[PDB]
Design a protein around this ligand. Structure first.
Ligand SMILES: Nc1ncnc2c1ncn2[C@@H]1O[C@H](COP(=O)(O)OP(=O)(O)OP(=O)(O)O)[C@@H](O)[C@H]1O
Ligand SMILES: Nc1ncnc2c1ncn2[C@@H]1O[C@H](COP(=O)(O)OP(=O)(O)O)[C@@H](O)[C@H]1O
Ligand SMILES: [Mg+2]
Lengths: 211, 383, 172, 193, 351, 29, 52
């Protein structure tokens, strides 16, 4: 809490206090970007902020669209997530890194808020309710999660060994659903099952354990 | 003479006039604002009132503030000095190097080039990607489309196509940023100063590109007309100069979305699923201005974000009629770890015919289509 | 039935005035017999026509902008999201039960500003700058524009710093 | 149980007030009595500010609206057709409906007199023979035994001739249109030949 | 003799209150007819579709940035008509009736009303003699008679234009060795195609020689909304000329879904009540009066025929989408052209 | 100046003509 | 006289049930918006309505 600010719009408050709370939430963190430091921002329950946007307009005699959300709701989440940046050298070199949270409606990737925020943001982390009960905690989807900048965005010693981690995980997700025959043929259709399963049992951890 | 803003509803504002109302698609200016604000009229309300669209944010317009008439459409400064410049929708420098070293301002709203001045001679544009040049061969002066989901690799194909064709041409090109991220905007500015397409100093006149940027931060007035601002400077270099210019427009879908965000706000009923009722004349008016005539050549390169790999939405389903060469990106081939994840079935161009290229090109690409369709019809039964 | 017929209606063609001499004499005692039922004409302030549930529709307010914080007469803060022809739709921050038909609406003039700075490190406010953490008001802080557009293209550089999360599921 | 028939139909809910008003006043034969009485209320709505506050203020209660109008409307020579009308608009807040109900009552009264407007534009002002040669072609362009007013007008871009702006019809016998249509019949025959 | 015949017009007027998006709402016009073609001041025409109590709604055939508020519209007193006849053969016109080829005007033509009723019961004779369309997958498997309705449904990039044009080239490969009466004339109506695709199509009808027989009506995607709406009716009004002369005619509408995008775009702009998938309710009626116009007239009223080939572009093979649901209901059959089996070598992919 | 707010009808009660008609026929003698 | 504050009760007179109203929106015209907590069959447009 020494190095943490928290703006907290509850559900028992009005709509525009929830509508402004990620906007005021990035107003704090632009100061940390302006004066050279680095800033972390998490826009938690950003779909519920968009429902807080949908309440105000539909009382305001404004035309609705997809799922009765208004027209400009892309522009809401656009400038909410464009003001986080990494400045040049000429203004301190400060940064902002963005965590929006979008809850899918039990698996609608084509949900209206989802298609906006998956197209704005740079990398996504899928957390299905499938992977959360197979022991994988935190339940990251590997084949569906992409980033942009790749190298020089990880630990550089990790960066060399990550290609040995990702590509072996790439074949393993293809052979895991082929376990309906009992094949384990030619010491490869068993070993990539033997490798990637321990990779899943590698890559679990505990809640609230920063390592 | 001049009028006042009478009504503000979000990003559309209403200006009343005392006689001699402005023509449609003209430019308006408000004084006393923070930045110069351009209002582009889209419909007449009826009671001496034009209804506008806002090139920047309206937060600050008082009711009754002074609004002058420029009596004319949006004017961007076109010219040879505009190369090496990062350009706005309304003609501004946003790279912070003085004014635009150019003259002869031009109306960015016009009619399409007519049917008589149409080019039918087709030349294969060899790019350098083994799935493009074999399967979906592009056309010199023709249209290049790029579909695919958010996270399949559309924009990293586009800068790869710049390094392929926009460097080995020598002439001029134009990058028309329509509502993409600033991250893929700012990074392209660095990787064209280092690659030497855009220069700084006193060598500004030998460069090869202008950047017309209407990225995601702007309100949808700017994201809806940066497509046209990037277009007309490409059509300025075509008719006056004669050079072939490569238009690299990014997120044509964001052009159609920026229209659709306020199309309901101008008093129109929504169309199919919630997109705009007038998408046909919005996109069809956009596309057929981008052609190649007898006078010059424009080779359009179009990237389109499609939502969740569904081609049944009518906002990209109007675009499929409007693109000769189409490079449809599947997320499945990227989930296989294959880059570029270009569909062997969905991506098909118009050059692919033995009556133009030759039978040695058409038969292997068709031979690719036999072995890859049956591979899809067998990988269901291989499980 | 056009506006030139309306501007022709601005030219008087009455041809007789056998009312105007007397209705100008009984006008002022009429408005001053029923003087208590008159709210004063309000120009640069505002007064509520309709109020409910967080959206309050306010007559007048010739001076406001889009996104100007307004203050109702009970101390409740507000925001002008859209501005119609004769009225201004005002969004209401907080519970709205205290506002009636006829209450005063005060323009604060500024764009909405929430206190920024490093003195807020350790404080939990809501989206409006008011503390809920029970440690009093914010010290060594200042207001800033929450409606500011993003930094431009010339302002940014290529990202380098990896932002370790402390999670092997993420960082690898 | 019968009303005097309206000479032309109109639209609804704001102009058929005037249609009903004409159907009442022509039964009382008070036609030019009450029509310029509507004009005085517009001058009352033009010059005075206290009355015109009552036609647009959304905070005055629904009993001060009627108890000022019936207080202002004593006899004073004012007709009780007019007095019961202006009671009714302030009864239901329709005091803003005056500037529409007049101009259609203006239209309906000029529909009772068979008396149509026009506006004739020339390059030359009309002398006492030039104007009386104008009407004999103009009265071919009204449909019946109507009246005619004159609103003579000067513009330099017409090169002689006229344009009868009926506001419903227009007849162009100006030479600036004739030389334009002469040029279009040149080009449609030089390109075909 | 032109100066001796100049009586000035009395022409009735209308002033514009509100104008936007190619829709101009006009005031006045005490006698304008439903669907009457009007003309504006600045040379651009217009049709009044809906006529309300106070203002009359007028759709605009062209650019709309020329009309201010307070401009004037003149009524031409005629429902919208197109010049029909033999002089159109080889020309590339727009859907309203003007040429865009650059070949000057259309001579040896006659204007006729684009809006009439279909042939009744006793006008019909049962279609017995066959039309031949060159593609053997069409002719043998799913055959098509002279004076018949057959829908070329499909995906995009799959060959619906190819089944259309290879039929056209077959007629030129059949008309040179068939007598004067039973020669099948082509009117391929291009709706919603590019202005550069028609340039390829004007080339292929010239280079093969089919432009002695083809009339290319190409309302593009670049012009306004009602031209794409009117291009099938005018193109079928061109097919009306070859019917009552007793010849045989081939009329092809391509991408009639875009004409549904045309009738959608004006209806929601004109605030007509929306129906399923926000199309107007009467869009099935505006598809039927098009497609019931082409038939076989009997041996007492001309003997000629008219066979219509509409084209619907689906999305992924959904033959139950609302626009395809209409056209499959009014037409007879279906030539389903799937994209997936197109790469399976069966050309055309005729399921 | 003082008639710009009066330039158009504005009211509630879309059945207003039926309200005023009962308040115009009383003064009919 | 004066429109009461939001979410305050009303007590109607003259109904067969003691029917209570609750004001939620002040809909202009010196008129408020209510939701009736009981059966509304039998309300005439003149019945006296008092507040707590
Ligand atoms: N027999 C064939 N052999 C090879 N290619 C063919 C054949 N028939 C059609 N095509 C391909 O079809 C493509 C376009 O043809 P056509 O325009 O008829 O398709 P379409 O379904 O109308 O496409 P769109 O609807 O997008 O216009 C061309 O690229 C051509 O290569
Ligand atoms: N040929 C390739 N080599 C390396 N990475 C690629 C390649 N093609 C696609 N990618 C990856 O795909 C990701 C998405 O790229 P981008 O074009 O930004 O997607 P979108 O257009 O959906 O935003 C990038 O992070 C990139 O690393
Ligand atoms: Mg096609």
């Amino acid at each position: 809490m020494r190095y943490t600010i928290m703006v907290s719009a509850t559900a028992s408050d009005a709509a525009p206090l929830q509508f402004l709370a990620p906007y005021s939430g990035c107003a704090m963190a632009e100061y940390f970007r302006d004066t050279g430091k680095h800033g972390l921002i998490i826009y938690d329950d950003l779909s519920k902020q968009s429902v807080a946007y949908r309440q105000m307009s539909l009382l305001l005699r404004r035309p609705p669209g997809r799922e009765a959300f208004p027209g400009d709701v892309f522009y809401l989440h656009s400038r909410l997530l464009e003001r986080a940046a990494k400045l040049s050298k000429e203004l301190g070199g400060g940064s902002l890194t963005a965590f929006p949270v979008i809850e899918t409606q039990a698996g609608d990737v084509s949900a209206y808020i989802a298609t906006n925020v998956i197209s704005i943001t740079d990398g996504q982390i899928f957390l299905e309710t499938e992977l959360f009960y197979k022991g994988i905690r935190p339940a990251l989807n590997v084949g569906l999660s992409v980033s942009r900048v790749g190298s020089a965005a990880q630990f550089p010693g990790m960066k060399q060994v990550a290609g040995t981690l990702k590509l072996e995980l790439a074949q393993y997700r293809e052979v895991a659903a082929f376990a309906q025959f009992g094949s384990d043929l030619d010491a490869a259709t068993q070993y990539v099952l033997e490798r990637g399963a321990r990779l899943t049992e590698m890559l679990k951890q505990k809640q609230f354990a920063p390592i | 003479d001049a009028g006042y803003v009478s009504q503000v509803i979000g990003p559309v504002v209403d200006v009343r006039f005392d006689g001699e109302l402005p023509s449609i698609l003209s430019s308006l200016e408000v004084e006393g604002h923070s930045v110069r604000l351009v209002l582009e009229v889209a419909q007449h309300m009826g009671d001496n009132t034009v209804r506008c669209i806002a090139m920047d944010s309206t937060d600050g317009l008082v009711r009754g503030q002074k609004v002058v008439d420029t009596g004319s459409p949006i004017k961007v400064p076109v010219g040879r000095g505009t190369l090496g410049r990062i350009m706005n929708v309304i003609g501004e420098p946003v790279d912070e190097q003085g004014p635009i070293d150019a003259a002869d301002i031009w109306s960015i709203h016009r009619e399409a080039p007519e049917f008589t001045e149409q080019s039918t001679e087709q030349e294969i544009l060899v790019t350098g990607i083994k799935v493009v040049d074999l399967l979906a061969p592009y056309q010199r002066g023709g249209k290049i489309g790029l579909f695919g989901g958010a996270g399949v690799g559309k924009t990293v194909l586009i800068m790869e196509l710049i390094n392929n064709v926009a460097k080995a041409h020598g002439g001029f090109s134009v990058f028309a940023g329509v509502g993409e991220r600033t991250r893929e905007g700012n990074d392209l500015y660095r990787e064209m100063i280092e690659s030497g397409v855009i220069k700084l100093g006193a060598e500004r006149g030998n460069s090869k590109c202008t950047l017309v940027y209407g990225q995601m931060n702007e309100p949808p007035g700017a994201r809806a007309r940066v497509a046209l601002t990037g277009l007309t400077v490409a059509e300025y270099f075509r008719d006056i100069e004669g050079q072939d210019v490569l238009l690299f427009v990014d997120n044509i879908f964001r052009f159609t979305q920026a229209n659709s965000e306020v199309s309901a706000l101008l008093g129109r009923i929504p169309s199919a699923v919630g997109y705009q009722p007038t998408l046909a004349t919005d996109l069809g008016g956009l596309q057929e201005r981008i052609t190649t005539t007898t006078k010059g050549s424009i080779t359009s390169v179009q990237a389109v974000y499609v939502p969740a790999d569904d081609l049944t939405d009518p906002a990209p389903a109007t675009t499929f009629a409007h693109l000769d060469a189409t490079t449809v990106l599947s997320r499945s081939i990227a989930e296989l770890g294959i880059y570029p994840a270009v569909d062997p079935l969905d991506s098909t161009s118009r050059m692919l015919n033995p009556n133009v290229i030759g039978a040695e090109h058409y038969n292997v690409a068709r031979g690719v289509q036999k072995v890859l369709q049956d591979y899809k019809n067998l990988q269901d039964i291989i499980a | 039935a056009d506006a030139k017929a309306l501007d022709e209606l601005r030219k008087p063609k009455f041809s007789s005035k056998y009312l105007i001499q007397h209705v100008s004499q009984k006008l002022i005692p009429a408005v001053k017999e029923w003087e208590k039922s008159y709210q004063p004409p309000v120009i640069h302030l505002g007064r509520v026509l309709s109020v409910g549930d967080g959206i309050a529709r306010v007559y007048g307010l010739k001076s406001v902008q889009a996104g100007e914080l307004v203050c109702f007469d009970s101390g409740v803060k507000g925001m002008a999201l859209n501005l119609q022809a004769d009225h201004v739709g005002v969004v209401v921050f907080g519970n709205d039960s205290v506002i009636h038909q006829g209450d005063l609406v005060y323009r604060t003039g500024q764009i909405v500003n929430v206190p920024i700075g490093p003195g807020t490190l350790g404080r939990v406010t809501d989206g409006l700058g008011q503390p809920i953490d029970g440690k009093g008001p914010l010290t060594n802080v200042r207001s800033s524009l929450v409606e500011v557009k993003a930094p431009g293209i010339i302002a940014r550089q290529s990202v380098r710093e990896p932002l370790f999360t402390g999670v092997k599921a993420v960082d690898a | 149980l019968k009303l005097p028939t309206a000479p032309l139909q109109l639209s609804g809910t704001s102009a058929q007030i005037a249609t009903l008003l004409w159907q009442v006043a022509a039964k009382e034969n008070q036609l030019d009595k009450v029509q310029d009485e509507l004009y005085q209320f517009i001058e009352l709505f033009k010059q005075h500010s206290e009355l015109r506050r009552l036609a647009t203020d959304p905070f005055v209660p629904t009993l001060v609206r009627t108890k000022i109008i019936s207080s202002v409307l004593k006899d004073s020579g004012a007709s009780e057709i007019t007095k019961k009308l202006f009671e009714a608009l302030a009864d239901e807040g329709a005091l803003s409906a005056l500037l529409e109900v007049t101009v259609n009552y203006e239209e309906l009264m000029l529909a009772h007199k068979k008396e149509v407007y026009c506006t004739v534009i020339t390059a030359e002002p009309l002398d006492k023979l030039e104007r009386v040669e104008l009407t004999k072609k103009a009265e071919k362009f009204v449909d019946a035994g109507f009246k005619l007013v004159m609103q003579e007008k000067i513009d330099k871009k017409l090169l002689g001739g006229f344009v009868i702006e009926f506001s419903d019809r227009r007849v162009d016998m100006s030479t600036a249109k004739k030389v334009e249509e002469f040029n279009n019949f040149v080009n449609k025959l030089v390109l075909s030949i | 003799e032109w100066e001796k015949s100049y009586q000035p017009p009395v022409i009735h007027l209308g002033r514009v209150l509100s104008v936007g998006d190619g829709i101009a709402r006009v005031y006045g016009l005490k006698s304008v007819q439903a669907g009457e073609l009007v003309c504006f001041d600045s040379g651009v025409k217009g049709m009044a579709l809906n006529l309300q109590a106070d203002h009359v709604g007028v759709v605009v055939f062209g650019n709309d940035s020329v009309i201010h508020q307070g401009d004037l519209v003149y009524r031409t007193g005629q429902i919208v008509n197109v010049p029909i006849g033999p002089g159109t053969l080889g020309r590339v016109t727009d859907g309203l009736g003007q040429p865009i080829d650059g070949k000057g005007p259309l001579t040896n033509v006659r204007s006729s009303l684009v809006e009439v009723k279909a042939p009744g019961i006793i006008a019909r004779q049962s279609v017995r003699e066959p039309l031949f369309t060159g593609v053997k997958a069409v002719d043998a498997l799913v055959p098509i008679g002279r004076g018949q309705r057959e829908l070329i449904i499909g995906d995009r990039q799959t060959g619906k234009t190819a089944v259309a044009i290879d039929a056209i080239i077959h007629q030129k490969n059949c008309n040179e060795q068939v007598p004067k009466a039973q020669r099948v004339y082509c009117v391929y109506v291009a709706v919603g195609q590019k202005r550069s695709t028609v340039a390829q199509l004007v080339k292929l009808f010239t280079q093969t020689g089919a432009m002695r027989y083809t009339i290319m009506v190409s309302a593009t995607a670049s012009d306004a909304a009602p031209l794409q709406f009117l291009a099938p009716y005018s193109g079928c009004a061109m097919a009306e000329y070859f019917r009552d002369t007793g010849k045989h005619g081939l009329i092809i509408y391509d991408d009639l879904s875009k004409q549904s995008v045309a009738y959608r775009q004006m209806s929601l702009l004109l605030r007509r009540p929306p129906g399923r998938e926000a199309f107007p309710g009467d869009v099935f009626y505006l598809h039927s009066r098009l497609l019931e116009r082409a038939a076989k007239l009997s041996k007492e009223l001309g003997g000629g025929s008219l066979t219509a080939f509409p084209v619907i572009e689906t999305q992924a093979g959904d033959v139950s989408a609302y626009i395809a649901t209409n056209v499959i209901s009014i037409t007879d059959g279906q030539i389903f052209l799937e994209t997936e089996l197109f790469y399976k070598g069966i050309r055309p992919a005729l399921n």
